[PDB]
Amino acid sequence: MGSMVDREQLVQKARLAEQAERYDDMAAAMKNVTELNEPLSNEERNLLSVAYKNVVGARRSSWRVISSIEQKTSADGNEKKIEMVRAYREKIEKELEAVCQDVLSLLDNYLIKNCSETQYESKVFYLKMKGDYYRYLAEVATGEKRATVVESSEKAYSEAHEISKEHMQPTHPIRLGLALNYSVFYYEIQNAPEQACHLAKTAFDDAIAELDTLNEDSYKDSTLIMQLLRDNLTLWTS
Amino acid sequence: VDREQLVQKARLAEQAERYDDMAAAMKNVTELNEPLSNEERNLLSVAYKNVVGARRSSWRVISSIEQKTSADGNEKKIEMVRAYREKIEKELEAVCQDVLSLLDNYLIKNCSETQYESKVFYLKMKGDYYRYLAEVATGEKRATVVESSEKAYSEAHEISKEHMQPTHPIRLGLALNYSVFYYEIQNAPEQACHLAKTAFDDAIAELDTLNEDSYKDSTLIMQLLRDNLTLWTSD
């Protein structure tokens, strides 16, 4: 494939787009790179994640503002104004669903599929992504549609977890990131704070015990995520 | 989708930080062909200021890179950055042609003789957006837009010194942006500083004329004119 399109120019464009803070361009470049069907370098894997996290993140942020407005607005009872806002919230939802769908397709049909059992970190990374984006779908879903995304997020986090227990140090940033977000899933989506705290604590303690397993490359990222785990732990606890 | 709904959407869009939506909403309001209220006019200005501003920011970062990497000298990496810059440029110029068009065909054309605040506001906008064009243009292209920016700034200047008070925020803002045109675009620091100081000192002279409604707007701009003079003189 790469014989047809220059793969390295595409990644360069993505780096470029990141610096101009043009994240649609960035995701577009990384989608294309993925589609060449080669496996993704650790950097490329980050570029991909950052691009889509900012593209979906912008919609999330706008949705939360518009949702909050709908609650106050409804309170008034002004028909026309409420419908304005609900319509607008829906426009943003549909952009959000479309970005999640783009990511999930990429994950299932390119990223997850391609990597080996031996490549263990890639598998957890992408499986966590799949968890996150079903979680993003879950945040704006209702009724049946919601249960299905929640279950899907669950399934994807649950498998990401099993693979990390068995094959990753409790201090690995990815295994730590996974524990973070999975706990967030339990608190925010499942409204199950008992599980949330348990998972966030279990992960934090296990990390602390093995504090020897940190290298010069890990200590920055492992400890920063261990703090977040704790920050959520403290909070939810109160 | 009547006029009051459009403005409601512009407001929502702003909360959402969705500035293209907000620009599109106020563009539809402008095209209803009636004058804009002060609220509406600020909504319009804010929308397009963020829309174009996102591009201006991008372009600078990309432009900065072109210079630094032209050194490394790879002739296909140089070519790509140049392309990316040009992609951004054409978006930015398109936003500016769009605003300018609203200005010449609707907003400016629709002022009555006695709507001086409005004219100074719209001529300063016209001034601003030809300036945005000048930041990315070169050669005769630059000369042409720089001339246009000047021509608009200058007419706003004269209407404002005859019909508005030194403490008026639209007049003060004109001075600040116009002083910037002199500094950044025409590269005339002396003529910049004179314009910034005169507007500041004139405002101080008549500080008593600040009304309760806009003293916050006027005072912040006065703060900026100073920050500018400090920076520009200090070098």
């Binding site: 994640s49 950052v50 996290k53 900012n54 996150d132 990131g177 973070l180 977000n181 967030v184 608190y187 925010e188 995520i225 977040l228 920050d231 959520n232 909070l235 939810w236 | 200021k49 601003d128 803002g173 600040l176 942006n177 910037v180 950044e184 701009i221 900026l224 920050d227 500018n228």
Partner: peptide, 11 residues
Amino acid sequence: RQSVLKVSLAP
């Protein structure tokens, strides 16, 4: 220059 003008993992 001036002219008038509960977390999850982070990128």
